[PDB]
Structure formats: C-alpha cells, structure tokens
C-alpha cells in the first residue's frame, strides 16, 4: 500500500507548484444567475462571471479553462489575530475546454 508521504509527493497538486498564474481545468457544478461556481481540483471552488460570448455554452458540468491566482483568499487585517478567509478561491475564466 502506497504511503501518504508518497501520495503527496506524486500528487497533481504537489506538481503544480505555486498556483499563481497557472493554467488548470475546472468543472461548473453550480450556477446562480450569471455566476458560475467552478471546481478546479482544489480545496475551495472559484466563482466567475458568465462570459458575454457563448454564454449559453457555460452550463453545469461544462469543463472550462482557468488561470489560478490563489487557492484560498485570505488576509490578516489591523488588529486581527488570525487571517480572515472568505472560503473561496481566485481564478480567471478563460473559456471552454476543447473536447477533442
């Protein structure tokens, strides 16, 4: 049985390295009006806006392309003892993935 240490070393997330300005594939699982909730394989989903072009194409289950920025949006503020987190990830929707 593979060890947890081995699993982590060869994990896709460990291979990604820093997540800033990386390209990843996500999946839309929830849509509220023109807001798309996209799972890109991380801890937290991201929330993007439906593009004007090919808006109807972005339906639930649609795999898309993204440019990650943060896996979790967090920041300590003046007088805080802990980082405030919004339980959300940061990414830029680039467009649909070609099925090919």
């Amino acid at each position: 049985v593979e060890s947890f240490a081995s699993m982590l070393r060869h994990s896709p997330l460990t291979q990604l390295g820093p997540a800033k300005d990386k390209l990843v594939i996500g999946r839309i699982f929830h849509i509220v009006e023109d807001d798309l909730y996209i799972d890109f394989g991380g801890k937290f989903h991201c929330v993007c806006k439906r593009p004007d072009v090919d808006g109807e194409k972005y339906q639930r289950g649609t795999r898309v392309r993204l440019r990650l920025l943060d896996l979790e949006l967090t920041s300590r503020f003046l007088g805080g003892t802990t980082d405030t987190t919004i339980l959300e990830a940061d990414a830029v929707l680039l467009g649909l993935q070609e099925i090919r």
Partner: protein, 78 residues
C-alpha cells in the same frame, strides 16, 4: 511545521522561470495526470542518474530530449 519541499522543486522552479507553465492546461481531477513540467522533471532525473553533474548540462539536454518527443517548449522570458 515543516515546509514541504521535495528535491524536484529545484528542477520545477527552473522550468517555470524559463518556460513558464506548459501551454497544456493542468487537469487536477485525473489522479495520474502527467504535466509538461512533470515529464521534464522525469527526464531531468533520468539524465542525472547517468551521472551528469552540471545543472546547465542537464537543463539544455532535457530540453532537447523533449523537443525530440515533440513537446512544444517556448523559452518565454516575458
């Protein structure tokens, strides 16, 4: 808390600085996904097993091997 840094990160850091992230998009839902960078690190390791000791030699030779494989590596300084 131990900062998690494997030995491949030295190689991966150079690859991202020289070529950026592979134009192919990462798929983090496939448990066995092999990215363009991870193949670079697998070849760089193979050459290092042969006994090459110069980092410059291993980086330019690995680029040539992937070029023969057909992977499109762009040395984007931008």
């Amino acid at each position: 808390i131990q900062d998690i840094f494997y030995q491949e990160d030295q190689i991966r850091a150079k690859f991202f600085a020289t070529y950026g992230s592979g134009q192919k998009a990462f798929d983090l839902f496939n448990p066995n996904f092999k990215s363009t960078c991870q193949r670079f690190v697998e070849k760089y390791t193979e050459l290092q097993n042969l006994g090459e000791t110069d980092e410059e030699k291993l980086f330019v030779e690995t680029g040539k091997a992937l070029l023969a494989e057909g992977i499109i590596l762009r040395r984007v300084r931008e």
